[PDB]
């Protein structure tokens, strides 16, 4: 149908959008702390702690799939790398540290991603 191409149109459009924030989140992380899994070869009880781990190269393999139905998903897991490491991790770390500020330089970015997909009608 047109209808179901709209759709797809619409789908296709928050996904660059998405993929501008998810650029703009990312280098507010220049450690590249967050860039990849925890891996569980490296911290084996990692999901004894963290039930739902996140991290950048996870949310894009998502997002290229179109697999962020509206913004809300996306921040979704977006908290959950900040909110997993802020767990794991003693505030006297660096790795605290760095969610601390990727949390506050990306709420700025956020806050008008908000603005625009609600703006141009994206979800």
Known sequence: SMEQVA???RLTELTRLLRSVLDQLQDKDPA???AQPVSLKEVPDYLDHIKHPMDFA???KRLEAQG???LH???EDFDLIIDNCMKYNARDTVFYRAAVRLRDQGGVVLRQARR?????GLE
């Open 7 to 9: 759709m797809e149109l």
């Open 73 to 75: 998903e996306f921040e």
């Open 68 to 70: 962020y139905k509206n």
């Open 32 to 34: 590249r702390i967050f």
């Open 116 to 120: 625009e997909v609600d703006s141009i």
């Open 58 to 60: 996870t949310m894009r």
